[PDB]
């Protein structure tokens, strides 16, 4: 089709426009959305070359096939700016895309549809379905532990692993690690793939909470998620991820249990007087007691004493308080269990009532 044209209700266009814009934020066309009209469907695509988000919008009114690309932010802002219940009539006119509603007319610049980037064809090796709430829980339980710009580029993302009847996520930045697993109720083949951090965040933002199930397809070099009328696709990170099974502390001989909120609030107050750069806190564990101390270069000091359940040997251990607070904020449970070994070894932190997630934090030298 050479003369693309469609008419849609604003209410059917807004959420798809906001969603496909997710990967956006170098190449000029990357600031544009690809619009394609064919046989009762409008497709909207946004990409950053590593991932792509597609939305399908049913066209209930007469339309003409074709394709173009338009500035995403401007097109979204025009549609959002129109009144509730507006009908939006769109058509290509030469090299301009016209947007009309009531007595409002907008002429936008375009870039050719033929020039829009496309991810290569691929075959899925594994397919499964799960509730959006389950995928959201897995990602939220671990995403804070991904690295940002580590040279070990495989850490700037999240491991997605199928094993038995479970889907598992793992994230680590070399200082701390998070692992969460959930049952899928389907026997799955064994697969482990690394999703880029930007893709993890977009996948997480696509999970609208709602009851539409999520269908996942994994290839050797790509992952795809289908949720309602949206399709997210991302390239995978081609590297070797660490094995969480070998990162978990072996035989922690010291088990501390305490209220999650009380522990979180005590660490949050101690953090105020920690070094702004190093963020170090000192923990002293003794019979049924935890003492948390923090000091800074001005020699200001915070001290918190908590009653806890503990009967192991006395020990002192240092931690970056932001890493501890990140774990306690991710747990959102009543009680927490901290499993220790010695002052130079990692700690494992878990919800005292559930083994679905586990967190590992490496200490600081005291």
């Amino acid at each position: 089709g050479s003369h693309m044209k469609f008419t849609v209700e604003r209410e059917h266009l807004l959420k798809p426009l906001q969603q496909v814009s997710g990967p956006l934020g170098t190449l000029p066309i990357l600031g544009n959305l690809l619009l394609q009209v064919a046989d009762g469907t409008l497709s909207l695509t946004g990409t950053d070359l590593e991932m792509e988000m597609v939305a399908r919008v049913a066209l209930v009114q007469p339309h003409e096939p074709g394709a173009t690309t338009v500035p995403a932010r401007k097109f979204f802002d025009i549609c959002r700016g129109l009144p509730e219940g507006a009908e939006i009539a769109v058509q290509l006119e030469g090299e301009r895309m016209l947007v009309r509603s009531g007595r409002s007319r907008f002429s936008l610049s375009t870039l050719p549809a033929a020039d829009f980037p496309n991810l290569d064809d691929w075959q899925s090796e594994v397919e499964f379905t799960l509730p959006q709430a389950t995928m959201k829980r897995l990602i939220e339980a671990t995403q804070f532990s991904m690295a940002h710009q580590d040279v070990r580029y495989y850490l700037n993302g999240m491991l997605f692993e199928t094993e038995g009847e479970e889907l598992r996520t793992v994230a680590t930045d070399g200082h701390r690690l998070a692992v969460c697993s959930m049952p899928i109720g389907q026997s799955l083949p064994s697969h482990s793939v690394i999703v880029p951090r930007k893709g993890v965040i977009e996948l997480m933002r696509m999970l609208d909470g709602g009851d539409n199930p999520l269908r996942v397809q994994i290839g050797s070099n790509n992952i795809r998620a289908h949720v309602g009328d949206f399709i997210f696709t991302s390239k995978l990170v081609d590297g070797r991820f660490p094995d969480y099974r070998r990162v978990l502390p072996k035989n922690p001989d010291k088990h501390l249990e305490a209220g999650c909120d009380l522990l979180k609030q005590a660490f949050a107050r101690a953090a105020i007087l920690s070094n702004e750069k190093f963020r170090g806190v000192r923990l002293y564990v003794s019979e049924n007691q935890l003492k948390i101390t923090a000091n800074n270069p001005e020699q200001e000091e915070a001290e918190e004493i908590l009653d806890v359940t503990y009967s192991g040997a006395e020990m002192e251990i240092g931690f970056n308080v932001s890493y501890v607070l990140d774990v306690l904020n991710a747990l959102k449970c009543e009680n927490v269990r901290m499993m220790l070994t010695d002052s130079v070894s990692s700690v494992q932190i878990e919800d005292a009532a559930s083994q679905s997630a586990a967190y590992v934090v490496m200490p600081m030298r005291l």
């Binding site: 070399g174 200082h175 701390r176 070998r246 990162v247 970056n320 990692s346 590992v360 490496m362």
Partner: peptide, 6 residues
């Protein structure tokens, strides 16, 4: 900060 043995 010490490193996790990855």
């Amino acid at each position: 900060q010490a490193d996790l043995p990855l």
